[PDB]
Amino acid sequence: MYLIEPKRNGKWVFDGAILLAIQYWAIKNLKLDETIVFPYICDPHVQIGYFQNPSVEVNLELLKQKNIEVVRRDTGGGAIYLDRNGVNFCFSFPYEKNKNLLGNYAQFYDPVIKVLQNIGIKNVQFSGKNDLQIEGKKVSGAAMSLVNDRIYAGFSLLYDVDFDFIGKILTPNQRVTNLKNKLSKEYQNFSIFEIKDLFLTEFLKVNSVEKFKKYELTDSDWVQIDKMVAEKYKNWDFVWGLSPNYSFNRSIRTKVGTITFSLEINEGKISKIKISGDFFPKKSLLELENFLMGTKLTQDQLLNRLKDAKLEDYFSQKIDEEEICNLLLNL
Ligand SMILES: Nc1ncnc2c1ncn2[C@@H]1O[C@H](COP(=O)(O)OC(=O)CCCC[C@@H]2CCSS2)[C@@H](O)[C@H]1O
């Protein structure tokens, strides 16, 4: 198991966008045939999933007011708020050695639950979706995707929360707790760097690993990471361009999550379409949106096109194609 701390010439980095960039850089460029761990503690910012639209997920005025960034990550899932009171861990798992991990939140979280138990946390449970919950209240969210031969997976930990701010800055569908007061009393006043440390030590134990193999980002890695920051994580086209607000917007709750269709209509046909939501598609939806372009907004064309798109190739659960058809027929 490798550990990549987000350090630059020995300085700890807290920029959420750079932190993802580090991870994705590793994913793409670090051919280590071992799990790499990426602990990260970020300055306040909102991180949204790849398929999400920041405009509908964030209170944009509160974000501007508080002068904090939106950062889109590469994985699906939903929008989280991240500050110095959260400790997150991403991973680059060799896909061949963890073939059953893709989409398997339970497996992914098993060592985490184990770590949290070991650390005195009451009754942390896998939510069954992609979360960890104590007595109804979410303490962690997770996301993953397959990229190259690597599974990119990450979970957050809400060590301490600003409950007021979190429910104000995130506008989903328009509840969570801290871990601080829930650890063994020995740990209850640990700072965030101490929790990260405690968690990583515990994570090694729970995973039967004596020590992390050391990987320090070199100047040269940083040049590539900085480039991915410029071209992607802090690139408007990626953060904002990716999810345009088209004229018509409809959403359905489905098993995979809330799917929103944002589309343009010219001559009774879908002219532009953007499918967004907090889900975890099997492959990129760009192909599906492209497939749907040109479809007449009639039952017959929509049903057929939606059938032909083989939605199961794109989403894990079954989507009601007719639900989507009928939703779109109303425009
Ligand atoms: N920092 C944070 N951590 C955990 N849960 C949060 C957080 N912020 C908000 N929430 C709550 O989760 C829901 C949205 O959860 P939802 O289930 O929609 O999706 C997620 O959680 C994505 C997890 C983040 C993936 C990153 C890849 C490695 S590190 S983390 C939001 O509305 C809040 O109620």
Numbering used by the authors: 1 to 174, 188 to 344
Question: Could you pull the original sentences from the published paper?
Answer:
Lipoate protein ligases (Lpls) are responsible for the metabolism of lipoic acid. Here, a new lipoate protein ligase from M. hyopneumoniae was verified, and its structure was solved.
The residues corresponding to residue Q47 in Mhp-Lpl all have a small side chain, such as isoleucine or valine, in the LplA proteins from other species. The large-sized side chain of residue Q47 in Mhp-Lpl pushes the dithiolane ring of the lipoyl moiety away and flips toward the large β-sheet in the N-terminal domain. Moreover, the conserved valine residue in the lipoate-binding loop (77 in Ec-LplA and 75 in Ef-LplA-2) is substituted with an isoleucine residue (I80), which enhances the hydrophobic interaction with lipoyl-AMP and explains why it is difficult to remove the unidentified AMP-fatty acid conjugate from Mhp-Lpl expressed in E. coli.
